[PDB]
Structure formats: C-alpha cells, structure tokens
Amino acid sequence: PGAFGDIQSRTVSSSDLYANTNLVLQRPKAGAIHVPYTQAPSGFEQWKK
Amino acid sequence: STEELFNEYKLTRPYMARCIRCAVGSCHSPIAIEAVKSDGHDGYVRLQTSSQY
C-alpha cells in the first residue's frame, strides 16, 4: 500500500488486477446513505511525487 | 454527435445524492459530485456528478 505497484496489471488491457491498498470500511454516518472507506493514498501518484 | 449517446444518456435518469455542503449544512443535492480527476497537466479536470449534460 501507498507505494509503486500497489495495484498491478500484467498488461494494460489485461483482465487481471492485483490490488493491495489497505482498503477498510468505516461505519456510515447516522442518517446517511454512502459507503465510507479508508485507503492508503495512491502509490503511483506518490511515486510521481 | 448523436452516435455517442445511445446509452450514456437515453436510459440514464440523473439522480439526487447526498452532499456534505449545500450552502446550509448537509444535503441531498441534485448536483452531488461523485469524483474529481485532476491527473492531467494544464488544470483540466474531469468531474463526475449526479447531474447530466
């Protein structure tokens, strides 16, 4: 998570995808319809930084 | 131009979704923003919303 290659595809058009981004689900706010989640920020964008 | 919109609009029905700020508190907005992508270069952003264009 949070590093280069956090998600990987064998080919740009491939149907496979290994993902490891520390995705977790938080409880929805009271009286709200949404799916809260918490993730490590993108490893590609951090690598570009 | 009409060849690009057989399905992206003609069967789509914009919706109303929760917004965190509608000029008074929280909200069920008709223009709720779902995603904002700014990975381009010269300040161009693609914005996904609940409205339709």
From Swiss-Prot, chain A:
<comment type="function">
    <text>Class II viral fusion protein. Fusion activity is inactive as long as E1 is bound to E2 in mature virion. After virus attachment to cell receptor LDLRAD3 and endocytosis, acidification of the endosome induce dissociation of E1/E2 heterodimer and concomitant trimerization of the E1 subunits. This E1 trimer is fusion active, and promotes release of viral nucleocapsid in cytoplasm after endosome and viral membrane fusion. Efficient fusion requires the presence of cholesterol and sphingolipid in the target membrane.</text>
</comment>
<protein>
    <recommendedName>
        <fullName>Spike glycoprotein E1</fullName>
    </recommendedName>
</protein>
<comment type="subunit">
    <text>Interacts with spike glycoprotein E2. The precursor of protein E3/E2 and E1 form a heterodimer shortly after synthesis. Processing of the precursor of protein E3/E2 into E2 and E3 results in a heterodimer of the spike glycoproteins E2 and E1. Spike at virion surface are constituted of three E2-E1 heterodimers. After target cell attachment and endocytosis, E1 change conformation to form homotrimers. Interacts with 6K protein. Interacts (via fusion peptide loop) with host LDLRAD3 (via domain LDL-receptor class A 1); this interaction mediates viral entry to the host cell.</text>
</comment>
